Amino acid sequence: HVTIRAIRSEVLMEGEYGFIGKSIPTDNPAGQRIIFCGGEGTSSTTGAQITLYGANNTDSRRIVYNGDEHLFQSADVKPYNDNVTALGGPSNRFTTAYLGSNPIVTANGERKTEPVVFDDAFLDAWGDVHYIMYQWLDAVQLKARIHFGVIAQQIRDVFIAHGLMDESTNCRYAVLCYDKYPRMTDTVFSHNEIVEHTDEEGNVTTTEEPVYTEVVIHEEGEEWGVRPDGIFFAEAAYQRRKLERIEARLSALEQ
Amino acid sequence: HVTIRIRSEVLMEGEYGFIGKSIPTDNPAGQRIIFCGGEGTSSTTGAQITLYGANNTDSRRIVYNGDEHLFQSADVKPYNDNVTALGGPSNRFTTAYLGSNPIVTANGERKTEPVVFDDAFLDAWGDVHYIMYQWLDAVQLKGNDARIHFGVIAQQIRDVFIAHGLMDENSCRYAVLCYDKYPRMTDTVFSHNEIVEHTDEEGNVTTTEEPVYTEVVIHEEGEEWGVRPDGIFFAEAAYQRRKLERIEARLSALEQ
Amino acid sequence: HVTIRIRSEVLMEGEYGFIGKSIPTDNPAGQRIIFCGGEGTSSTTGAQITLYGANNTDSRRIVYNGDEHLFQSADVKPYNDNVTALGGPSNRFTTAYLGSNPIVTANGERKTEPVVFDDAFLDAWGDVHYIMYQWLDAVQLKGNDARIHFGVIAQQIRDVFIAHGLMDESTNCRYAVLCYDKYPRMTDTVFSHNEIVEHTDEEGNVTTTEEPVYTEVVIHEEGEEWGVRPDGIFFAEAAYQRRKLERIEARLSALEQ
Lengths: 255, 256, 257
Ligand SMILES: [Br-]
Ligand SMILES: [Br-]
Ligand SMILES: [Br-]
Ligand SMILES: [Br-]
Ligand SMILES: [Ca+2]
Ligand SMILES: [Cl-]
Prior knowledge:
The structure is a homotrimer. Chain A is an alpha+beta fold. Chain A is built from five helices and 17 strands. Chain A is elongated.
């Protein structure tokens, strides 16, 4: 219930550091949060918004960055810690990454077991993997690009046929990755209602209060995925053997 | 303005707090709030996050401006599934540093029936050249010693498809080769302070320093051809598999 | 120090609003503002974003602390083109979850006229080994039941380049497929606890109140990493195996007749 007046309004915080927080709400602690907004209103149609969720909130310690552009200037977009958190998720995939150069994969000092050749039994299986062209039903419905890849289930049906994986829950090989995700809810702005106020004398006045609703973003679910790079490492090992053996049958027969 | 007085604090009560920006009277195209770890409107002063209004020229933009962007305690995720991307045609990330290889999933979205690689597309993929290259500018500095990169030139894969009638001079049936046109990127940025002078009915002339913001071009309109290395390697795996099978064939027909 | 009083509202007028942090009189090195969705200076209290001042030990750092980071209504983008990165040598993302495969583009940047993979290089590439492994970490927690990954060891590929004269036994490498990085240590100023602070009257009376104590921590010490570009590896492997297939076919076409 305050407005900072000015060309520009300024709030300057003194001390060693400044703190702008949200007290534990008296009557609905589950919605505890601050909404920072570039616009006039509590609705995000009003301007860009960043929302910090209190620990007492349904979606606890959540942050939602809401804008039509998220531009990170002057520095890499990094994880705080090394190799603990990820980009995206099973039910939060980015459509793609646009890169100036090919991804770098590294262990950063972390050490592996002793490197091991692709056992022949595994190669026999890998031969049954199919490299296919496909389309999305959704896309074709609107017209539509063809994509190249390998159906996760296709690799899975093969992993089973060759006894490598029990009919997942878990999987021995990271190239085929199964995940199981909860449902994602969020409390978001709906509209502002009119609320009537009448005194004991009986006169009626109105004010505008915003209405927030809990909304489902996506439901519970599971998913199978693959690691293309892993697939290509295995294909490499695969074909190299097919080349080793073919050059033996070329020699014994040349002479 | 207000100033808040070894640590200053602002506690917001109620169910939630709201800190927002009214609609400017005279320049609603500039509607925004600048949050700064420092005392100056200039980002040389401290890390900044700027929320743009809907009225702003750059509607609902967010600019995070710091010398480190460290996201702690949680994955960096898109709000929705398979609707937003990392980077852009003219907003490329140099790379991603990963502890493991990317996971690609369809999360249950439906695909058409998995189809083999036709022999026509395979004949053509045989013309796709794998190559080494260096960046001219690096070559300006280190010449022969400039770092060497691997890949395939987007345009020459385009040429191969066009030659093999799997594409026309337009601008593609395949996801492996992806073209994009992109708008110019502008922003409003702090440049310098400007001394403004204020003179009253009496001759008196006072002085002050107001900050000037200006509209800067970050990049002009352009277009770009690109490729998905993973898509390239899927076509290759197909290609190379057809060849070895013929190799297997030949061989068999030497023991008979 | 103020409190704003179902919802509290601060509203900034003028063209734009500025909310900043003055230069600290005593400890300018801690200059920063902490935004919190919760009641306390501790992050356990709620999601926080900390903006570091230029004067701060960690100059112009931003720290986003939450249990979810959800980016809505727009791609997560770098401000400029091809100058900043996702993750780092000592700040790696475990993975990226995508719906389609990454797009690599040069956006019009000039290249040296592309060259074939030379025979000398292909020769060496043959010694590169494709292997399997587990993380010494995973095993200490899942034993022989830990996930098995595919890839190559950056060191054995280096040995291959070294043994073939393509690379001096020289941290700076000639090919981008093999990445070496040297990195600084990472500290951060972080809330640890509350302390007992004694207050002595001018009459000698000692009262007491608690205040939050921030402390400097070491997130990780300096170090270095060798890494590889899997894509780069496959580009070379596609050139290698193509030359081999070619030599095999010629031996076939010669065997016949
Ligand atoms: Br509103
Ligand atoms: Br599509
Ligand atoms: Br593709
Ligand atoms: Br490379
Ligand atoms: Ca793998
Ligand atoms: Cl300034």
